[PDB]
Amino acid sequence: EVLKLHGAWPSPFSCRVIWALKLKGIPYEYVEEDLFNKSPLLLQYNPVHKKIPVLVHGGKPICESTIILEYLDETWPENPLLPSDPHERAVARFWVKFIEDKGTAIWNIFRTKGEELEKAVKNCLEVLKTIEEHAMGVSDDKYFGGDKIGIVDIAFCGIAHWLGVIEEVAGVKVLESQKFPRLHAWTENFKEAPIIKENLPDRDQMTAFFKRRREMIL
Amino acid sequence: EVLKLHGAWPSPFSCRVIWALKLKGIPYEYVEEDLFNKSPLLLQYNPVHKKIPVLVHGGKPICESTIILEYLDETWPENPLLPSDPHERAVARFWVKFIEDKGTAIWNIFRTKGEELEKAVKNCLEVLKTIEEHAMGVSDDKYFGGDKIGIVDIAFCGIAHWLGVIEEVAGVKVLESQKFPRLHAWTENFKEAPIIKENLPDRDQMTAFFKRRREMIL
Numbered sequence A, B: 001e002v003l004k005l006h007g008a009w010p011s012p013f014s015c016r017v018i019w020a021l022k023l024k025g026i027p028y029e030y031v032e033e034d035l036f037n038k039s040p041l042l043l044q045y046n047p048v049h050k051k052i053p054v055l056v057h058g059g060k061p062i063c064e065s066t067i068i069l070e071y072l073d074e075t076w077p078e079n080p081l082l083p084s085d086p087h088e089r090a091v092a093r094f095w096v097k098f099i100e101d102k103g104t105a106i107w108n109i110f111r112t113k114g115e116e117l118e119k120a121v122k123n124c125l126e127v128l129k130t131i132e133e134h135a136m137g138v139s140d141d142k143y144f145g146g147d148k149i150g151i152v153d154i155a156f157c158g159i160a161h162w163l164g165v166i167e168e169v170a171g172v173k174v175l176e177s178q179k180f181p182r183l184h185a186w187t188e189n190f191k192e193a194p195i196i197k198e199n200l201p202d203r204d205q206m207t208a209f210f211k212r213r214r215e216m217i218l
Helices: A012-024 A040-045 A065-075 A086-102 A104-110 A114-134 A151-155 A157-170 A181-191 A203-215 B012-024 B040-045 B065-075 B086-102 B104-110 B114-134 B151-155 B157-170 B181-191 B203-215
Strands: A003-007 A029-032 A054-057 A060-063 B003-007 B029-032 B054-057 B060-063
Touching (some): A003 A040, A012 A065, A012 A157, A054 A065, A060 B086, A065 A151, A065 B086, A086 A151, A086 B060, A104 A114, A151 A157, B012 B157, B040 B054, B065 B151, B086 B114, B104 B114, B104 B157, B114 B157, B114 B181, B151 B157, B157 B181
16 A cells, blocks of 8 residues: 655654654655645645645545554554553543644744744743643653653654744744753653654754744744 | 542533443443532642543543543443544544534633624534534444444534533524534434433533523623
8 A cells, every 4th residue: 555645844743754654664655745835635635624744545644643643553553652551541642632732832932023922932831841840751761652752752843853943043942951851851862862863854954944934924 | 440530510521431431331430520619639630731521540540531532442442432444543533633623612602792702603613514514424324433422423522412502502503404414413313322312411401500600701
């Protein structure tokens, strides 16, 4: 069955799926989708939200990055992203949903100035604090998945890699190592992981790309 | 292992779990939680959102109604709420997430008047239209789960039962049978299902309860 991933190179959400595919070593064909002028296939595949990623297996589309990750686990069980224990799965699903629900708190820094910027920074700091204080282990593990990358690690990839770009692009500091030390350590450990590291879109290049987009929003 | 469900009787979210427990016939102890002055257990169990439902198994809490439903399926596989096929599970998960993301569109009618009410009715109609046009089967099935109740049926229970109360309480019409005929048929079939029917909180009583709460918000 032909497997195609429709994505966009600077999207954290598309990158989640790239990572998940690469951690399992599943072959796929990648398709870049323009987001200003959308393709007929994107609109056919995702009539409800019209967003990437879409994973298409045997011509059948699956929308939503988090839902795609679960589908990958069910169809290719080797190297699970989900914990095996049902209680632990439930807690991991909680943090995936949480970051889905709060993810705007990253992206609002990106597109605001002045006093609405000062407010977005405030909302973002509360999300980070909640993760720092409630989501991190009772354990000595590197990753939310233990000694290997799991679904919460992937779901938090925005925090690990995109927030720092967006901070620099908006001219603010948010995720400071001394404030969120456990989350900070995790970001460094995540990005230094094999497979993650080799598939991180270039920081400096994303920074220039988002710099351009921010100006042309302000 | 002792199983306790912390809930509130008029909550659609608590009722999801009641239904799921009852469809599988899992014994549990129910605990009503006040929502104005929250208990220390609720706050201990759900420090992040401080909301019901919480399911507590062997003293270990699980938050989020949708996540609880998945936990029930994994721990008591008899009478699955999830489709077995991974593609079909993925599509069901999509609509569960969708109603989670859009669920405010019910609850904003409940707490608005005048022109913000007229706007909430408009937002709600677009959600209903999206479901009517994209979520309903290519099939002759009664339920989103087929010939039996599944996770999408439960997730949509707000639409089936609470919206009609909230419409009447706010003095508006939204879900009109002639506009959303397939979704309308589904609401009637859902509510007439054994186990669902015997566990629907009383309409007239919810109506008076929410009437009271709306006044004391306006």
